[PDB]
Amino acid sequence: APRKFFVGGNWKMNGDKKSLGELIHTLNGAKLSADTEVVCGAPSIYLDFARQKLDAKIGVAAQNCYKVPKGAFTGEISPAMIKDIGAAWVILGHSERRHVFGESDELIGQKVAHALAEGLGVIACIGEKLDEREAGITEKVVFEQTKAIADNVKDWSKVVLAYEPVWAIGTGYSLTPQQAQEVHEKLRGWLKSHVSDAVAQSTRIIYGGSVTGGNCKELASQHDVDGFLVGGASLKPEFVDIINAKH
Amino acid sequence: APRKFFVGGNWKMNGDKKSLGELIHTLNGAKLSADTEVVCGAPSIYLDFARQKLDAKIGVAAQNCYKVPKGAFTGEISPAMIKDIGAAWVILGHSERRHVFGESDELIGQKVAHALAEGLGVIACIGEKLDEREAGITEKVVFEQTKAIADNVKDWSKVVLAYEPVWAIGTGYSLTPQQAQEVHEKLRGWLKSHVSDAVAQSTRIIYGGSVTGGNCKELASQHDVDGFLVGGASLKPEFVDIINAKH
Q1: Among A19, A63, A74, which would you mutate to test the B interface (most chain B Cβ atoms within 10 Å of its Cβ)?
Q2: ∠ Cα B214 B93 B150 (to 5°)
Q3: Which residues of B are catalytic?
Q4: Dmax over Cα atoms in chain A, in whole Å?
Q5: 3.40.140.10, 3.20.20.70, 3.30.2350.10, 3.90.25.10: which CATH number matches A1-247?
């Protein structure tokens, strides 16, 4: 019935072996809540290293991948390769991929279908820009994004949706608890009526966008917030407090 | 005065630990020409592994990187990370980054300057699409692309130009030796007049695009072809015969 609290940490393009090694040693020794599912998204060049050093109770995610297993696609990695080093998750459609590197809704729908067909879990991110929110069209944009994903997903049991306002990323200005509830509620209600009631009840919709130890307890006690995608705070020991947001 | 013959192997999005390990062991025990500088571009996920297993005589290259050392750029790696695992090269501006993934000449230029600043060698790729060749503007396009690179190079000693006609990539169709010579001659001429004489004569300009064991001997014996960027043949043992193309 209940969805398991899910907290992913997106290290983005930070770290070396020495500094990620210290961060991992800290997580491996932290008191983590037993009912929380934790995943860390390491840069591709350190995925093998992260997976070796991290305790098996903690998931490892690639920060992107491509939509075929192999081929002439210089600079890309496939799910085949992610599985090969032993990782089980992939973050797809992150705001920075969509908006800095120009990945379309349809390309992400495609990447997700493949990731799933190869047996990866997927954290599919969606979110509106500031001009889109000031205009009132937040729902139209996130629905459009989710719809490109849904048309490609055969099975949702291994998918987590991450709602991440593009303008909340890296700014200290997060959504108020009430603003975030508003979008997940609507998003869950989209899944209900466009996929099924079961997929709505059982799919985790997590919030990202300036999540910190300061603001997470309030966010987590919202009915339709199922966890967090954490950026900058994932590189610091306050990441532990966020994993334990529910007490 | 002459330039070392140079052969880069671009594995692109291919391989796993087992099959790349076999390939690396083949190279490690191969008879290679001593006056050939070899470099292997591995997928980012296998860079660490590749650098550890490959003999130190053989260089290792990333297939791409971003333009700053760290930051909120999900899915990207920096030269600081490439250096951290001991690799010394990066491939930048590949046809596939340019045309599949939308990277502009200005972004590639910024990438080049940052990689050079952090102490990496660079294989910068330039080349025209088929519509551009039949329109008569091959030279316009490659000079435009070369200029975006040169405007961001302080020190040319660590740079290798790879000319790849995009219509030659994966079409089983290479330029004739005369056609390839014609472009490298033009390119070296361009460097002569827009940079310096010394740079023109010391800078390696390698040919990429449908290079096999069958055609490399004839290509390499042209006066301004200084080596190759090999695509699909870099995964076969005939990669060894291309490294040895000069006899």
Answers
A1: A74
A2: 110
A3: 94, 164
A4: 49
A5: 3.20.20.70
Tell me, what amino acid is at B31? K
How far apart are alpha carbons B175 and B180 in whole angstroms? Answer: 6
Instruction: Mention every residue, 6+ apart, whose C-beta is less than 8 A from residue A18.
Output: none
Question: Is residue A10 part of an annotated ligand binding site?
Answer: yes
Distance CA A28, CA A52 (A): 12
- Which chain A residue lies closest to B63 (C-alpha atoms)? A75
Contact A97 B74 (CB under 8 A): yes
Judged by CB atoms closer than 8 Å, whether chains meet at B45 and A82 is answered as yes
Interchain pair A101, B96: CB under 8 A: no
- Parse chain B into domains and list their residue ranges: 1-247
User: Tokens standing for B29?
Assistant: 């025990």
Quick one: resolution in A?
2.9
Distance CA B145, CA B112 (A): 12
Take residue B87 and report the two structure tokens written for it.
Answer: 């690799």
Give Cα B115 to chain centroid, integer Å: 14
Token look-up 């998918």 returns: A159
One-letter amino acid of A82: I
Stated length of chain B:
247
Q: How many CB atoms lie within 10 A of CB A113?
A: 17
Nearest CA in chain A to B49: A48
Q: Are B116 and B158 in contact (CB under 8 A)?
A: yes
User: Comparing C-alpha atoms, which of B2, B10, B32 is closest to residue B162?
Assistant: B10
A230, A11 contact by CB (below 8 A)? no
> CA separation (Å) from A24 to A58, A88, A126?
10, 18, 28
Which of B45, B65, B114, B118 should we substitute to test contact with A (largest number of A Cβ atoms within 10 Å)? B45
